[PDB]
Amino acid sequence: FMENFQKVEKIGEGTYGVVYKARNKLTGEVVALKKIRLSTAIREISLLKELNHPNIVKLLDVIHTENKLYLVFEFLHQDLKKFMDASALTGIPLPLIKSYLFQLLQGLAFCHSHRVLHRDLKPQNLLINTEGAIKLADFGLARAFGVRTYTHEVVTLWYRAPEILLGCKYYSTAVDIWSLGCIFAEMVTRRALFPGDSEIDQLFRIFRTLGTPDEVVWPGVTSMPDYKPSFPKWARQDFSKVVPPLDEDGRSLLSQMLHYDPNKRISAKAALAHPFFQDVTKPVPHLRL
């Protein structure tokens, strides 16, 4: 039971607590409702209510009652994780991959221009609709929560930027570009790019593909908190082996999203101008709800 909602249904375990599909009692509208497992965060998250962009899941409300905290979002019917699983036999068509990447970059460019990072992008917080839109959920929450324990559930590391895995306590816009590059690669190949089981397995999967980073490609890397001079030194592989059959435009863009040094990583705004998007369109997905 809930005072202000009816037909409340669990839909997932999230970074911060249970996520429900719920119907507002007064209006009948269907929303996603994210009970935070437990004020500097309430004011800061409440600022996120002001943000509106077509590629960002609207934060409709912040409800603080009975010493509980709930976030109310507009509801979308499928996430990219489920869509990629449903699309595993055929693959997502390239024009739709390109459309989704373009739209996600517009959402990131918007948030970043408003000084809001995500820090934890992953297919589970990318939501799609029947009209061909994709939207990013949960921007700004990681900073407000303070990176921080809000679930006992197993955290996905697969999309974490190397700066994060090497113990850098200082985030930048580049962490979100890394995560989206990993998601791009996964849409293309139908396999996660770096499916690490632990922080060190995550870090070593990255190193085995992109080469072990050094001061030449990443000035400052050897001073990062969790950097170890004893890390094995892997040579770097070609993106042509990693994301076939992606064309050279897509591989060029992906390589710019996956530079080791966050400062060298392409921005969302610059990525939107990349030649890969010259022929972008907005196709209709085949969604089975």
Ligand X SMILES: O=C(O)Cc1cccc(Nc2ccncn2)c1
Q: Cite the active site residues.
A: 120
Q: Which stretch in 69-77, 104-112, 186-194, 200-208 sits in contact with ligand X by CB under 6 A?
A: 69-77
Count CB-CB contacts under 10 A for residue 124. 20
76 is in an annotated binding site: yes
CB of 230 to ligand X, least distance (A): 34
The residue number with the shortest CB distance to ligand X is 14
- Alpha-carbon Rg for the chain in angstroms: 19
Residues 6+ away with beta carbon under 8 Å from 218: 260, 261
The residue from 22, 33, 56, 57 that contacts ligand X (CB under 6 A) is 57
Q: Which residues contact 189 (CB under 8 A, 6 or more apart)?
A: 242, 243, 244
> Among residue numbers 228 through 247, which ones bind ligand X (CB under 6 A)?
none
Q: Give the number of residues in contact with ligand X, rule: CB under 6 A.
A: 17
Residues 114-133 that bind ligand X (CB under 6 A): 124-125, 127
100 labeled binding residue: no
Residue 202 lies near ligand X (rule: CB under 6 A): no
Q: Which of residues 1-30 bind ligand X (CB under 6 A)?
A: 11-12, 14-16, 19
Q: Interface residues for ligand X in 132-191 (CB under 6 A)?
A: 137-138
Q: Per the annotation, does 67 bind a ligand?
A: no
When binding is defined by CB under 6 A, the residue of 33, 36, 72, 73 that contacts ligand X is: 73
Instruction: Provide the minimum distance between the beta carbon of 106 and ligand X in the complex, in angstroms, as a whole number.
Output: 18
Residue number, 10 or 264, with CB nearest to ligand X: 10
Which residue numbers belong to the known binding site for Mg(2+)? 125, 138
Catalog residues that contact ligand X under the rule CB under 6 A.
11-12, 14-16, 19, 32, 34, 57, 73, 75-76, 124-125, 127, 137-138
Which residue numbers belong to the known binding site for ATP? 11-19, 34, 74-76, 79, 122-125, 138
